[PDB]
Amino acid sequence: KLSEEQQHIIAILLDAHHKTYDPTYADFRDFRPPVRPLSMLPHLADLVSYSIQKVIGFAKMIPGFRDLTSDDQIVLLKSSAIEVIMLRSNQSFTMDDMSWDCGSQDYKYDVTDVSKAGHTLELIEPLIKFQVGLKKLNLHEEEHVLLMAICIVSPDRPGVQDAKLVEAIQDRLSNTLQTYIRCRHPPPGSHQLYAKMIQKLADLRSLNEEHSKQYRSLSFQPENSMKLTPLVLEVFGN
């Protein structure tokens, strides 16, 4: 069953998430104002930038993450950043209208807002489909934080050095998730739940890939790169 360590792992992750995800979305007011020719870029650039900071705050609390070297921690964050932001955004996504509801109407985002950031349906369509399938899973918050932590500590991320150590940390998280599903997730919602969760990690790899492509495209234009932030440039590329 759920050993003491595993129960500890869940509590730590839950708290780490609670300390990095503000469901009141109060900070969105500090971002450059959203405008509804890439009129949403300044706003979403700031939102993404803000989100990267929050994802880092979460990662540092992942039991074992700090044991990794500086370079491996950096490699994991740069490669998973966009994936965890997509994954954590599911919390504000609504299947009512396929949009992300972050408090007010000014901070309620849809397919048009993302396109107005310079992205095409080649990314947006599968992004919504992802959000929909993840939502359909109705994960317990415990499963949600474990999935984000597992996504961050992935051994196959390019540039990783101590893959062995990275894999050990992730396996400890995986076994925690698997065991939690058996012991705390009642059927039928638990039916192949683990496998479906891992499929979403594969889905994220594909989304990451497409995002990077469109990002390289968008940021290649100095006028667009100019509207981004220093953190976004450092993490996503320059």
Add this chain to the structure above:
Amino acid sequence: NHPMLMNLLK
């Protein structure tokens, strides 16, 4: 180098 990421990591 990643100064900002590094700074946020420590």
